[PDB]
Write an enzyme that holds these catalytic residues in place. Structure first.
Site, mmCIF file in Angstrom:
data_model
loop_
_atom_site.group_PDB
_atom_site.id
_atom_site.type_symbol
_atom_site.label_atom_id
_atom_site.label_comp_id
_atom_site.label_asym_id
_atom_site.label_seq_id
_atom_site.Cartn_x
_atom_site.Cartn_y
_atom_site.Cartn_z
ATOM 1 C CB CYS A 32 -0.795 -0.152 1.132
ATOM 2 S SG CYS A 32 -2.064 1.390 1.405
ATOM 3 C CB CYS A 35 1.716 1.136 4.217
ATOM 4 S SG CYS A 35 0.066 1.146 4.769
#
Length: 105
Positions: A32, A35
């Protein structure tokens, strides 16, 4: 720095072991983008705030933990004091991360 938490038992143990120290948990997914963007920082903040316990939970591996924790986006940061959740927010917002660490101890 950062401890990887890989089960519900490990999570509870970490919260129990923390005593009165603030605990910050990053619920993250490696794939992600936000992230990836926050990961090195969460790490940097963990060195600036050395009396704070920093934990990471990988939501794809620890799906049961992610479910229990009511995560629906990543990164999600949850903050604990004496086993109690005292804060939470999502997103790769470095300013909010570091400020919340200060607000909650």
């Amino acid at each position: 720095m950062v401890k990887q938490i890989e089960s519900k038992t490990a999570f509870q143990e970490a919260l129990d072991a923390a005593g009165d120290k603030l605990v910050v948990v990053d619920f993250s997914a490696t794939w992600c983008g936000p992230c990836k963007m926050i990961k090195p920082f969460f790490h940097s903040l963990s060195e600036k705030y050395s009396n704070v316990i920093f934990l990471e939970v990988d939501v794809d591996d620890c799906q049961d933990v992610a479910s229990e924790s009511e995560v629906k986006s990543m990164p999600t940061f949850q903050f604990f004091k004496k086993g109690q959740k005292v804060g939470e927010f999502s997103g790769a917002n470095k300013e909010k991360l570091e400020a919340t660490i200060n607000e909650l101890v």
